[PDB]
Design an enzyme around this catalytic site. Structure first.
Site, PDB file in Angstrom:
ATOM      1  N   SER C  32      -1.700  -1.064   6.816  1.00  0.00           N
ATOM      2  CA  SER C  32      -2.139  -0.565   8.120  1.00  0.00           C
ATOM      3  C   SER C  32      -1.263   0.527   8.689  1.00  0.00           C
ATOM      4  CB  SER C  32      -2.270  -1.698   9.138  1.00  0.00           C
ATOM      5  OG  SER C  32      -3.459  -2.438   8.906  1.00  0.00           O
ATOM      6  N   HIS C  63     -15.281   3.388   7.014  1.00  0.00           N
ATOM      7  CA  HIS C  63     -14.750   4.750   6.948  1.00  0.00           C
ATOM      8  C   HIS C  63     -13.228   4.744   6.803  1.00  0.00           C
ATOM      9  CE1 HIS C  63     -18.409   4.275   9.304  1.00  0.00           C
ATOM     10  NE2 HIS C  63     -18.820   5.391   8.714  1.00  0.00           N
ATOM     11  N   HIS C  85      -9.049  -7.973   2.610  1.00  0.00           N
ATOM     12  CA  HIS C  85      -8.230  -9.123   2.979  1.00  0.00           C
ATOM     13  C   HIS C  85      -9.127 -10.348   2.866  1.00  0.00           C
ATOM     14  CE1 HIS C  85      -6.484  -5.748   5.228  1.00  0.00           C
ATOM     15  NE2 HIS C  85      -5.379  -6.444   5.360  1.00  0.00           N
ATOM     16  N   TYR C  87      -9.087 -12.929   4.891  1.00  0.00           N
ATOM     17  CA  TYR C  87      -9.503 -13.321   6.245  1.00  0.00           C
ATOM     18  C   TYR C  87     -10.751 -12.592   6.698  1.00  0.00           C
ATOM     19  CZ  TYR C  87      -7.316  -8.971   8.070  1.00  0.00           C
ATOM     20  OH  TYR C  87      -6.874  -7.674   8.310  1.00  0.00           O
ATOM     21  N   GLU C  88     -11.118 -11.529   5.994  1.00  0.00           N
ATOM     22  CA  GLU C  88     -12.317 -10.776   6.328  1.00  0.00           C
ATOM     23  C   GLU C  88     -13.528 -11.462   5.726  1.00  0.00           C
ATOM     24  OE1 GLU C  88     -12.243  -6.446   5.719  1.00  0.00           O
ATOM     25  OE2 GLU C  88     -10.087  -6.634   5.368  1.00  0.00           O
ATOM     26  N   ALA C 115       1.913  -3.910   6.232  1.00  0.00           N
ATOM     27  CA  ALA C 115       2.628  -3.969   7.508  1.00  0.00           C
ATOM     28  C   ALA C 115       2.962  -5.455   7.664  1.00  0.00           C
ATOM     29  CB  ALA C 115       1.732  -3.493   8.639  1.00  0.00           C
ATOM     30  N   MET C 218      -0.601 -10.893   5.658  1.00  0.00           N
ATOM     31  CA  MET C 218      -1.843 -11.491   5.206  1.00  0.00           C
ATOM     32  C   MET C 218      -2.500 -10.795   4.021  1.00  0.00           C
ATOM     33  SD  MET C 218      -3.033 -12.023   9.253  1.00  0.00           S
ATOM     34  CE  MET C 218      -1.586 -12.434  10.403  1.00  0.00           C
ATOM     35  N   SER C 219      -1.712 -10.100   3.196  1.00  0.00           N
ATOM     36  CA  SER C 219      -2.241  -9.382   2.025  1.00  0.00           C
ATOM     37  C   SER C 219      -1.181  -9.181   0.921  1.00  0.00           C
ATOM     38  CB  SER C 219      -2.788  -8.016   2.466  1.00  0.00           C
ATOM     39  OG  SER C 219      -1.759  -7.215   3.045  1.00  0.00           O
ATOM     40  N   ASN C 242       6.867  -5.364  13.749  1.00  0.00           N
ATOM     41  CA  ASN C 242       7.265  -6.185  14.886  1.00  0.00           C
ATOM     42  C   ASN C 242       8.172  -7.318  14.451  1.00  0.00           C
ATOM     43  OD1 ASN C 242       4.447  -7.593  14.038  1.00  0.00           O
ATOM     44  ND2 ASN C 242       5.744  -9.108  15.083  1.00  0.00           N
ATOM     45  N   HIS C 256       0.494  -3.071  17.489  1.00  0.00           N
ATOM     46  CA  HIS C 256       1.291  -2.549  16.389  1.00  0.00           C
ATOM     47  C   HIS C 256       0.817  -1.159  15.995  1.00  0.00           C
ATOM     48  CE1 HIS C 256       2.536  -6.685  16.384  1.00  0.00           C
ATOM     49  NE2 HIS C 256       1.266  -7.034  16.257  1.00  0.00           N
TER      50      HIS C 256
END
Lengths: 288, 288, 288
Positions: C32, C63, C85, C87-88, C115, C218-219, C242, C256
């Site tokens: 990200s 996109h 991911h 979670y998607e 990130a 998460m990846s 963070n 973030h």
């Protein structure tokens, strides 16, 4: 629980009973390299998971996977050579299907074996660890063979696992190992189930250590859980096939099956040990 | 997120609104043995999950599971007697379906209750633990009710959970317990969700201890997560129904529902306590 | 393994080869805010996941998600802007699909970026952590991209992960950072994958700390696993977006992406750093 229905289990058990003259008291699940136990059977009768009605077939091993009925040191058995694993794509309700039918066959005891990695430092490849407890990692997240609606005909909704590995059988094995006059003693510790085909990283091996696991593997636990649900007596061992590098060090012990006598001998000793233990499994005839 | 569509929630909420004269501000989810709270309702209106449009029905309990609308100590409520659990076979998007509709009903607060095992030594069966935080074990692996594409109409993609259990409501409950003049104090600690129907082993109870869990259970967390996603104020308690044997000891506290006054009384005290707390839940009318 | 078939991968790779004049050696997966790396490409050729045959499309970003082929500092590349991911809602065999095709494209190296949250105290937002190891939480429970029957054409059944992040490339990056004359040093630590869209609680952040994680995300982990299965050289970095509140404190660092230069600059430095590192990735032509 899902996938199969009660009649599915009944139908598979009846097919077996009507196809084998054998009436097994003990069920034995062989781990990797431990399949040689089948050679110790008298009056052996072989079955292909394939030909047994609802029995899940093997993804690739196949021929490594078959059900053998026979007699081992005084007990009527049924050994499962080539067990199912969830990393092979098997949902836990398939991985444990056997146990459920073994129950409806008359089996009142289940001895489980598995090859594992050594997390506890004192272990040394070749070692045999008598399983005293387990940490079900896949279960903590939903991967528990009992997930789904519970069948009271098999057991309760919330079965206890704090007493899965029989203390009597555990003390009996402890004694028997001594009785044999074995050089190195019988190790005893906690097994940690971890799914996935790949192997651990040092970072992960260290959390397992922290969690208190003495040996790591990718099987056993589900089968043990459903066995207990059925009320079967359960006990087993883990053959340490390699020590675990828990420190940033060069790789080692990659292979486990192709390790010459390192495997051969160690597997050999566990297999006989298990046979001797048949004399320690309580006869259903209330022997005293 | 999966399984249902936004219109599914809208349709179920509208059916309820058009079938009940009640307009709930508070939603209360009852744990085991805690369902008696429904008896404290005035102008109660009962609904069968069964008759409510997209509402998941109960696998077995059924009659133990119903939605009751009424009035509790000054607040308009809707209590869910008999909650869904993932070990029953419910995917998390079904387990939390209620909360999502409660949101579209006007509920701005959710009080959750659950029966749990005591991991923190100082707890003693009968105790009530005000939930201050949680450790989502099923979530660490993918079992998070929010998995799937996020709906901005309900909330954000990455909602924060570090502040799920309202501090204001937590201090209000802390005060109220004192106000009541209660003998033993209100306990407060971290709850750890663990799926699967079966019970923990000493080995597993020790890792939960290590992880810092004060109480272990098989519910609550998912419902709390989606409630926060909706922006609802969330707070709840855990009724310690048994201390956890974290040392190789003889089993104990097997039963929890059939434990006479041990359950009865403790459940009784939590239920009233929750009612008294209705006076502490902020009225939507900006009361000051 | 599931979902796709070997020919699926072959067909997607051939379509790409027949549609791009480019023959990539390196594959880069952007995290990200790190998608700007695509701007550093010469002779760039853009592809929509959408138009590529079996390529999973984006749930919402779309996109933001596209495949760009070009040249970065001496190496032929293919950057994936906008990764998948779980979670998607993506099953791990979709999340990693790209890597599998990148392999059949000629890519022999994979640099991954993500990130993450800072668990190790010494980290400070803006920091860049060279990934040395990982703790696969989703994997411990069954969520391993390799679950299912193994394809020997891609790799082995039980691949080792204890050596996933290349030490050579890790020392090369360590040197290069020095070479640049960078003020603050290149951090190095263990990354912990955690699924689910929501953010951690202090209770959970503390167990990750205990587990020994230096950064949480998460990846990354799944992609790394399949890359290693294919035998590709793997290395990557994590941009600390963070610091993590591991003590009962007031929230902070919610956003973030919208953090001005805090993000901008830090992302900017990692992107160039990665380009400079192209000179350190071994040319297939056995350069010496």
């Amino acid at each position: 629980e899902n996938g199969y229905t009660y009649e599915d289990y009944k139908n598979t058990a009846e097919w077996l009973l009507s196809h084998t003259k054998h009436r097994p008291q003990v069920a034995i699940i062989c781990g990797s390299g431990l399949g040689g136990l089948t050679d110790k059977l008298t009056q052996a009768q072989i079955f292909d998971y394939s030909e047994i009605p609802n029995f899940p077939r093997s993804t690739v091993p196949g021929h490594a996977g078959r059900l053998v009925f026979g007699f081992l040191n005084g007990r009527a058995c049924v050994m499962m050579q080539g067990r199912f694993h969830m990393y092979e794509g098997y949902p836990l309700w398939k991985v444990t299907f056997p146990v459920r039918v073994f129950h409806l066959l008359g089996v009142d005891t289940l001895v489980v074996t598995n090859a594992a990695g050594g997390l506890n430092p004192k272990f040394e490849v070749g070692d045999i660890m008598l399983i005293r407890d387990h940490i079900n990692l896949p279960g903590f997240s939903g991967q528990n063979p009992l997930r789904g609606p519970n069948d009271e005909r098999f057991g309760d909704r919330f079965p206890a696992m704090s007493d899965a590995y029989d203390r009597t059988m555990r003390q009996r094995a402890l004694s028997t190992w001594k009785q044999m006059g074995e050089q190195r003693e019988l190790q005893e510790g906690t097994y940690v189930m971890v799914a996935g085909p790949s192997f651990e990283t040092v970072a992960e091996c260290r959390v397992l250590q922290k969690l208190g696991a003495d040996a790591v593997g990718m099987s056993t636990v589900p089968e043990v859980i459903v066995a207990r649900h059925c009320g079967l007596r359960v006990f087993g061992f883990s053959l340490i096939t390699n020590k675990v590098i828990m420190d940033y060090e060069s790789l080692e012990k990659a292979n486990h099956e192709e390790v010459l006598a390192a495997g051969k001998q160690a597997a050999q000793k566990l297999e006989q040990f298990v046979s001797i233990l048949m004399a320690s499994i309580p006869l259903p005839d209330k022997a005293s």
